Amino acid sequence: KIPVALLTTTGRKTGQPRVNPLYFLRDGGRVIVAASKGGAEKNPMWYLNLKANPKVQVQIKKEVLDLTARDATDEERAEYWPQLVTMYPSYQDYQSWTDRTIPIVVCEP
Ligand SMILES: C[C@H](OP(=O)(O)OC[C@@H](O)[C@@H](O)[C@@H](O)Cn1c2nc(=O)[nH]c(=O)c-2cc2ccc(O)cc21)C(=O)N[C@@H](CCC(=O)N[C@@H](CCC(=O)O)C(=O)O)C(=O)O
């Protein structure tokens, strides 16, 4: 069905590597993911990690990408959110059901 990417972040507290599966969008070299966490009240821990340490590793099939993660700008949100929703309509439901704006993370080389 929908492929997952494996995102590795550095635990902001422990400094240990943390891996989590996510759905993703490609924009050339960029990988885009949404810190939706099924519409939880709070941002997922991996998001907190990458905001404390922007260096992340992303594995897609056999490709291992060393990228730098940051929040999408207003204009990037406008471009990527609708693509994310088209690919996985549940994203819009999560956003509908949660207070926080769901972060969109741009991972770039
Ligand atoms: C519960 C927590 O996970 P989390 O980082 O909040 O991630 C929540 C979810 O987003 C994560 O489980 C995703 O993989 C769920 N998930 C998706 N989550 C998404 O947000 N978006 C997706 O598109 C998505 C797709 C998906 C597909 C398949 C699947 O099985 C899961 C999918 C966790 O793993 N707990 C760790 C925390 C590890 C950690 O980062 N700790 C930090 C400190 C954190 C802190 O400061 O409190 C550290 O080591 O220092 C632990 O306690 O052992």
Residue numbers in the entry: 43 to 151
Give the authors' words:
A deazaflavin-dependent nitroreductase (Ddn) from Mycobacterium tuberculosis catalyzes the reduction of nitroimidazoles such as PA-824, resulting in intracellular release of lethal reactive nitrogen species. The N-terminal 30 residues of Ddn are functionally important but are flexible or access multiple conformations, preventing structural characterization of the full-length, enzymatically active enzyme. The split barrel-like fold is characterized by a central six-stranded antiparallel β barrel in a Greek key topology with four α helices: A at the N terminus (the putative helix removed for Ddn structure determination), B after an extended loop between strands β3 and β4, and C and D between strands β5 and β6. The identification of these residues and the lack of classic catalytic residues in the active site suggest that Ddn functions primarily by precisely orienting PA-824 for efficient direct hydride transfer from F420 and potentially through additional transition-state stabilization.
Cocrystals of the NΔ40 construct with oxidized F420 were also obtained in two space groups and were solved by molecular replacement (Holo-1 in C2 at 2.1 Å resolution and Holo-2 in P21 at 1.8 Å resolution, with an rmsd for one chain of 0.3 Å over 109 aligned Cα atoms). The data from both crystals yielded clear difference electron density for the F420 coenzyme, with two glutamate residues in the tail that could be easily positioned. The crystal packing combined with crystallographic symmetry operations reveals the same decameric ring structure in both structures, with five monomers in the ASU of Holo-1 and ten in Holo-2 (two rings per ASU). In structures Holo-1 and Holo-2, F420 binds to a groove on the surface of Ddn through a series of hydrogen bonds and several salt bridges between positive charges on Ddn and the negatively charged phosphate and tail of the coenzyme. The sum of these interactions results in the Re face of F420 being presented for reaction with PA-824. The largest conformational changes between the apo- and F420-bound structures occur near the deazaflavin ring. The loop following strand β3 (residues 76–85) shifts away from the binding site in the presence of coenzyme in order to form the direct contacts to the phosphate and deazaflavin heterocycle outlined above, with the Cα of S78 moving approximately 4 Å in Holo-1 versus Apo-1. In Holo-1 and Holo-2, this loop packs against α helix D (residues 131–139) and generally exhibits lower mobility, indicated by a drop in atomic displacement parameters (ADPs) relative to the apo structures. Modeling was used to visualize the binding mode of PA-824, using the Holo-1 structure with F420 and placing the imidazole group of PA-824 at an appropriate distance from C5 of the flavin ring for hydride transfer (based on observations for other flavin-binding proteins; Fraaije and Mattevi, 2000).
